[PDB]
Design a protein around this ligand. Structure first.
Ligand code: CA
Ligand code: CA
Ligand code: CA
Lengths: 315, 280, 176
């Protein structure tokens, strides 16, 4: 797409992927980002559209790996361009993902993350006919110590482990170093990596591994009753506690009661809540940041503002 | 040595006053070679410390909390200007992230990278944070010299703090070193100047009190027309031999249409975007 | 433009050269024929001691680019054309820097050894011209004529200062 085509295309509820990349730079492996978003658990109208913003020269030598997925677009550009971010409606997306291919070409700890930190600041400072600070962003970091620059209403200290930091606890930063403990987790229990793989990849099977290993691309097939029965898995979703079927319990009522009824009536199985950072304060706040609570302990209060992490059935 | 030496000999210059302000430096590398010697020459007010401005423990050592201002110098000779300005913006956000209210002055090698500096939420040029873009000012001084030769050396001599040097031989250096002795200064106009037109106060302050007045804060204008009368509390820019001489400007009170010809705000001429084959 | 200000010594040959001289003293810099980015190193210290200076320099040098222009260029990365309006036209009414020749009829009668202060006063009061320096010929103080066309810069001449008819006047002049 050129800017004009992106601008008149009514992109909304979509994913934007911002790529720092160049003809010298190594392959990110973008098939692994697109595939979990193309699982047959979603209906075709439920599929989030995907836009890549970045060097076309770079995308041109990866795109054949992801040329069989339906709702995909490219804008030739730079994530630092306000005009490019406006042309793809950055205020209307469900996620902005910021990636860099340039992770390995200089090692100076500062120089590894400059672009991503400038890009996330450049999106936060936007204005629209709202400020951009409410936009959902996730940033890949090459150096987890650089996480301190992603937020300014936080508190920063060089000896803090990444998991304690506000931008990680809120789910807005990711670093491949958090997977270092997956080695020790998988030694002590071999089943874990199997669960993570099925939960994260969009449920890719050993048969899928074999077909992709032979043919190096995902190969299309005609419908059959078995091909259709393979859609009936759960998918991860967020539930808003302001809707009629649950909001009456979102009054300070118990998470355990929500769990019990949502499980027994819809097979919904909630497994955490995404709470507003300031919801424990007596004063109102303009802060839109949420942080993650995993397996709430029963007798735990639901504020009406909470988002529920859940696993929901196909239909 | 090639970056600090021109800075130090102006900051610590004798002609401004005998005040003490500059007392600390920080950098990740040790100050080897003919550089520690330049610190010895200024022992009582320099104090280098080894540490990195990316680390909040090193910001906490050099007391950034009450440091008044932070100055960030660029590598003018670097292989990648855009990496330099991004690096120096990393330093700006590191410092602002540690302390909201410190004043920051920074060199930028490219003009576009000054936009990125405005994204930082704790940056405000209304309170004296600013960037000196070297490409903008360098090519700007050259551009104004294409309108009047020598203007680029006139402007460059108005910032550098220099004393008057006496010369007895009748050479061109005698008149030059007299003109080099002044700087750009600024002061609030006396209430005695309020309600009357800018050219008239220029003639008064040149003739009666020996100050050349150039511009006034009508946000910031330069040689304003005879219809513009002075308000109370206007700041007024002057060229003068020394700072102590501008004080008289305050202390004085009688005593002794169908086509696009321009950019979107009319500041510049404009045309439809040409092809390069049309102008080669 | 010079990358090394020590190389300025090679730009002229009727000068005198010495490795310990600061650039501002040298003939090719004093004449306005060399520039080096190192002369802007003192703009750091000048801007610390007075925040208003960089604002003046910016408006005087850039062609008066405003904070609104910075915002438009930061968004769109190119200068965007607009149609005429009375406000777009009123924005033209700034001063511009220019050189005046002291051989023209409105000033040459005072270019006889007469005072810079009298030129300043009349050019200011009659045209709003505000001269701020003179560009004098390098050899104009000599009794002999010379073939040398080089001029050097005098900033803020001290009143009672003589105007030779050969001088060029640095001035700020109104739009029309
Ligand atoms: Ca922080
Ligand atoms: Ca000076
Ligand atoms: Ca020479």
């Amino acid at each position: 797409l050129t800017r004009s085509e992106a601008a008149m295309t009514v992109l909304s509820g979509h994913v934007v992927v911002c790529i720092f990349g160049d003809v010298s730079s190594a392959l990110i492996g973008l098939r692994n980002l697109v595939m979990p978003l193309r699982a047959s658990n979603f209906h075709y109208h439920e599929l989030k559209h995907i836009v890549f913003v970045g060097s076309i020269e770079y995308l041109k030598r990866e795109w054949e790996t992801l040329h069989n997925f339906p709702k995909v677009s490219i804008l030739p550009g730079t994530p630092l361009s306000r005009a490019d971010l406006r042309a793809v409606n950055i205020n209307l997306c469900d996620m902005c993902v910021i990636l860099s291919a340039n992770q390995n070409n200089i090692d100076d700890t500062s120089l590894q993350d400059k672009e991503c930190i400038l890009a996330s600041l450049n999106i936060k400072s936007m204005q629209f006919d709202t400020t951009g600070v409410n936009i959902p962003i996730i940033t890949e970091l090459v150096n987890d110590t650089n996480v301190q620059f992603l937020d300014q209403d936080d508190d920063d200290d060089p000896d803090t482990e990444l998991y304690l930091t506000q931008p990680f606890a809120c789910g807005t930063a990711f670093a491949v170093s958090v997977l270092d403990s997956l080695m020790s987790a998988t030694y002590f229990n071999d089943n874990i990596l199997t669960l993570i793989r099925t939960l994260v990849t969009g449920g890719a099977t050993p048969e899928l591994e074999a077909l992709i290993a032979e043919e190096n691309a995902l190969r299309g097939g005609y419908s059959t009753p078995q091909t259709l029965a393979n859609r009936d898995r759960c998918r991860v979703a967020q539930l808003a506690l302001l809707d009629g079927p649950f909001a009456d319990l979102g009054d300070g009522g118990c998470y355990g009661d929500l769990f019990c009824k949502a499980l027994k009536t819809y097979n919904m199985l909630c497994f955490g809540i995404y709470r507003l950072r300031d919801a424990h304060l007596s004063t109102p706040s303009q802060c839109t940041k949420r942080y993650v609570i995993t397996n709430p302990p029963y007798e735990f209060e639901l504020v009406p503002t909470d988002l529920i992490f859940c696993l929901m059935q196909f239909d | 040595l090639e970056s600090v030496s021109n800075f130090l000999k102006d900051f610590l210059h004798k002609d401004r006053d005998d005040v003490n302000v500059e007392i600390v430096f920080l950098h990740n590398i040790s100050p080897n070679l003919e550089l520690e010697a330049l610190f010895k020459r200024h022992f009582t007010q320099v104090e280098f410390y080894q540490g990195s401005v990316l680390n909040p423990h090193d910001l906490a050592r050099v007391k950034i909390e009450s440091a008044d201002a932070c100055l960030i110098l660029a590598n003018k000779y670097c292989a990648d200007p855009d990496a330099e300005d991004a690096s120096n913006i990393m330093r700006v956000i590191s410092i602002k992230n540690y302390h909201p209210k410190i004043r920051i002055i920074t060199q930028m090698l490219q003009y576009h990278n000054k936009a990125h500096l405005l994204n930082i939420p704790s940056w405000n040029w209304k309170e004296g944070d600013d960037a000196i873009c070297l490409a903008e000012l360098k090519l700007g001084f050259i551009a104004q010299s294409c309108l009047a030769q020598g203007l680029s050396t006139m402007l460059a001599n108005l910032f550098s703090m220099r004393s008057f040097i006496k010369i007895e031989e009748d050479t061109w250096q005698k008149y030059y070193l007299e003109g080099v002795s002044n700087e750009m200064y600024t002061e609030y106009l006396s209430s005695a100047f309020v309600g009357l037109s800018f050219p008239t106060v220029c003639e008064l302050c040149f003739v009666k009190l020996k100050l050349l007045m150039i511009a006034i804060e009508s946000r910031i204008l330069i040689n304003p027309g005879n219809h513009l009368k002075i308000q109370e509390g206007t700041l007024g820019f002057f060229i003068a031999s020394d700072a102590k001489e501008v004080k008289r400007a305050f202390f004085y009170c009688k005593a002794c249409s169908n086509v696009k010809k321009y950019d979107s705000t009319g500041m510049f001429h404009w045309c439809a975007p040409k092809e390069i084959e049309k102008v080669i």
